[PDB]
Ligand SMILES: O=N[O-]
Ligand SMILES: O=N[O-]
Ligand SMILES: O=N[O-]
Ligand SMILES: O=N[O-]
């Protein structure tokens with residue numbers, strides 16, 4: 001009887017940050033209430049000023065990470081304002097029935113809907129828009145995110161001992177297929193509707209023009225680099241709603257990795273690089289042991305360094321010479 | 333001494349259906365006899381009427397699922413009628429030696445051959461034609477299928493408890509590389525031999541023009557949708573002889589998944605999406621919990637919805653509101 | 665205190681062969697000294713005589729396999745002679761800190777450097793050059809290899825029992841992106857520097873022109889085929905520094921496979937085909953049971969047979985009819 005369960009309202013935060021939550025559940029099952037507003041907006045995705053008409057949940061690419069526990073109910077109020085122009089919906093890979101909720105959440109501009117589902121399986125899961133006949137277009141325009149369903153007793157290593165993270169980041173990787181004129185220059189349109197046929201043709205090449213973390217080339221760099229300290233335990237959730245990726249932390253490892261994102265399975269140990277299939281979210285746990293700059297990339301290095309799939313960590317603390325040292329510095 | 337083992341003759345059925353078999357072996361080892369006839373035929377692969385010269389085992393793309401038990405002998409009589417024009421053979425990834433049987437099964441039109449091999453490893457395995465110097469062409473023209481070698485005591489979960497399926501389907505996913513003229517229109521030829529150089533050039537782009545389930549765009553829809561009931565346990569075998577795929581059941585999960593198809597390994601639990609590498613068969617077990625329509629896709633959603641890699645389940649029975657419900661229906 | 669540990673100097677050998685080593689460590693921790701000389705050289709990569717300016721560690725593509733044990737120190741003296749023209753460095757995915765050693769190993773032509781790191785995690789790991797702003801170019805020009813860090817007590821099966829290999833081979837798979845003129849012919853340049861902008865454009869297509877084992881089409885064939893005997897236990901280490909691969913032994917299996925290369929994890933059993941993600945090294949153990957020729961391929965069969973990703977084993981010994989036999993040979 002759901003009416004006797006506690007409700008809690010959660011305010012979502014922008015990726016790569018994640019809303020406050022408990023790892024180990026401090027209450028019984030709850031109904032967890034989220035609200036998201038669909039926003040169609042112009043987005044600049046690279047250093048050259050290339051613009052697309054992005055389709056977003058809550059104004060970001062990716063949409064925000066939702067975090068609940070196993071056997072909670074998720075209640076999502078989804079709003080499509082009349083300033084938008086397209087029909088949207090939502091599919092949760094975490095849910096059971098009705099095309100992930102897709103069949104029940106079709107909202108024209110000016111409408112809203114409230115969906116509830118029970119989070120029966122623990123893991124990280126992709127969510128994405130999926131309107132009938134325009135699925136790939138919506139998803140490759142940025143309309144995806146992820147939900148994390150924690151086990152009620154938190155994460156465990158391969159021996160069943162507890163694993164507790166000190167920080168958590170969410171990296172959404174996005175393939176974009178920006179349409180090109182005859183010579184190879186990117187086209188510009190005034191509305192999402194204008195791009196449609198050109199977008200279908202660009203997608204059919206199966207060759208993205210950009211692959212980015214958090215919505216733009218270099219979004220997770222400089223002032224916006226991810227941070228941590230030597231000694232900290234960091235969980236990095238990574239999603240790709242459409243295409244395979246292979247994350248790698250340059251200078252580090254995935255100590256414990258659930259490459260396909262599902263926590264009832266034991267994690268893979270000591271990974272250098274792991275494969276997250278398109279349509280999946282994955283999670284990697286690392287303990288930092290050296291200070292300095294780290295690059296976190298898609299290890300198709302062309303996709304990383306030419307097409308944009310690269311971010312940075314800045315890590316503070318003490319250097320350990322036992323682990324690594326320059327014996328003789330570069331010299332004639 | 334094989335001459336003292338029972339023989340049994342099996343008549344194969346068209347995919348996605350699977351010939352009758354016992355999960356748990358009710359006899360000792362047997363020699364299991366199959367016959368297949370190679371058929372070269374014209375096939376219409378999409379709604380636009382695009383035609384290819386397909387190369388088939390037993391008249392279908394994919395070829396039929398063979399099912400035996402561990403330590404059975406498979407005896408396959410393979411017939412190439414004189415109405416065909418090419419040399420064919422067969423390679424079983426389930427077999428040991430002679431290039432999977434490839435070296436011993438070369439049959440010109442007008443010839444036949446009988447091969448026997450012991451099924452020493454349990455799992456689902458790809459079989460495909462592989463004639464010297466034309467391997468990719470034959471395989472990407474549709475000349476592949478799969479064999480399932482069950483453990484003698486049937487399937488087990490990750491704890492070793494029995495898993496029994498109520499139904500089994502076989503989904504063969506096929507990449508096609510139909511050659512294009514200067515403007516992007518599909519070419520047509522009178523014979524398989526005519527297409528050869530154009531086919532090599534199309535393949536070298538590494539970009540398929542179609543990716544289909546069971547031989548055509550929309551083959552597993554409408555009247556030909558897969559069916560089940562709430563409560564039923566369904567095994568879905570999925571093969572791709574040449575290219576990576578990432579299956580996903582929209583509205584469901586892979587409860588138990590052997591993504592690389594080999595049953596001595598424990599299954600992965602609660603998968604949203606899994607990666608079946610090119611040249612592999614995989615198997616996913618799901619128990620339906622909600623009625624309605626489900627889409628079963630390759631979750632590169634472009635490959636699914638634009639290039640054809642999408643099928644449907646129609647599931648009958650009772651709706652469960654605890655799992656999912658619309659609290660407030662789409663409204664102003 | 666490193667100064668009291670034994671040192672040992674290892675002379676590296678050309679792939680696919682591997683320097684002599686002990687599986688089970690017969691000493692305590694050591695500092696293991698390697699030297700590599702960077703060589704920029706012209707390389708012919710196919711039967712048509714197509715030439716590239718390759719960037720090599722020690723004159724080969726891939727660079728040589730280094731083999732140490734867990735908790736050894738690796739000390740690498742890396743030399744860039746003044747006959748070269750580019751700045752190079754090295755990143756070890758096996759190491760912790762400073763971008764895998766990348767940050768500490770930048771050597772202009774005429775310089776050398778000596779790096780030391782502790783091999784804290786057991787597995788096979790990729791190493792590759794990664795100079796700031798030219799990472800993909802260096803890696804896809806051939807500047808990668810692998811390091812194997814054995815557990816001190818050698819390899820174990822999924823039950824913890826010892827697995828001992830009789831031979832070990834190293835297969836490096838390389839994607840090349842040779843630039844094409846208007847009509848599709850390969851371009852030629854006098855220096856590496858000349859190709860740069862054309863190389864960036866070729867890479868951005870994400871479509872390689874060649875995919876090879878050991879640096880050329882057909883390098884692991886004929887006189888240079890890998891060999892073994894019926895009964896031998898063979899470890900095949902396989903690396904791809906930039907792009908996904910799916911190895912398959914035609915006529916065989918991966919008895920025990922660590923597809924993502926990390927030995928603290930149990931191996932996957934009875935694999936037909938496995939996925940090694942770009943930026944990873946993997947390892948497969950097989951026991952030969954039949955004599956004859958085997959093809960070892962990337963099982964995207966286009967990549968194998970049209971673009972070059974195929975090698976051979978020649979295996980000697982006794983044929984076993986129980987496993988496989990031709991009952992009726994190809995006949996009218
Ligand atoms: O500006 N909206 O796509
Ligand atoms: O658009 N909200 O009713
Ligand atoms: O699904 N493309 O990696
Ligand atoms: O092919 N996906 O990186």
Ligand SMILES: O=N[O-]
Pocket residue numbers: 257258259260261262263265266267600603
């Ligand atoms: O989804 N398996 O970690």
Ligand SMILES: O=N[O-]
Pocket residue numbers: 372373374385386523524
């Ligand atoms: O019609 N036979 O390709």
Ligand SMILES: O=N[O-]
Pocket residue numbers: 411412413414441442443444995996
């Ligand atoms: O073609 N059968 O002999």
Ligand SMILES: O=N[O-]
Pocket residue numbers: 574575576577610964
């Ligand atoms: O093998 N191509 O995914």
Ligand SMILES: O=N[O-]
Pocket residue numbers: 575576577632635
């Ligand atoms: O790249 N295969 O979907």
Ligand SMILES: O=N[O-]
Pocket residue numbers: 589590591592593594595597598599932935
């Ligand atoms: O093939 N492993 O399920």
Ligand SMILES: O=N[O-]
Pocket residue numbers: 704705706717718855856
């Ligand atoms: O010949 N050196 O690229």
Ligand SMILES: O=N[O-]
Pocket residue numbers: 331332743744745746773774775776
């Ligand atoms: O180039 N060695 O000093």
Ligand SMILES: O=N[O-]
Pocket residue numbers: 300906907908909942
């Ligand atoms: O990373 N490309 O398979």
Ligand SMILES: O=N[O-]
Pocket residue numbers: 907908909964967
């Ligand atoms: O997509 N890599 O074979």
Ligand SMILES: O=N[O-]
Pocket residue numbers: 268271921922923924925926927929930931
């Ligand atoms: O890296 N796992 O074998």
Ligand SMILES: [Cu+2]
Pocket residue numbers: 055087088089129130131138143
């Ligand atoms: Cu949408």
Ligand SMILES: [Cu+2]
Pocket residue numbers: 091093128279580631
């Ligand atoms: Cu989906």
Ligand SMILES: [Cu+2]
Pocket residue numbers: 387419420421461462463470475
């Ligand atoms: Cu054939």
Ligand SMILES: [Cu+2]
Pocket residue numbers: 423425460611912963
């Ligand atoms: Cu094969």
Ligand SMILES: [Cu+2]
Pocket residue numbers: 719751752753793794795802807
């Ligand atoms: Cu270099």
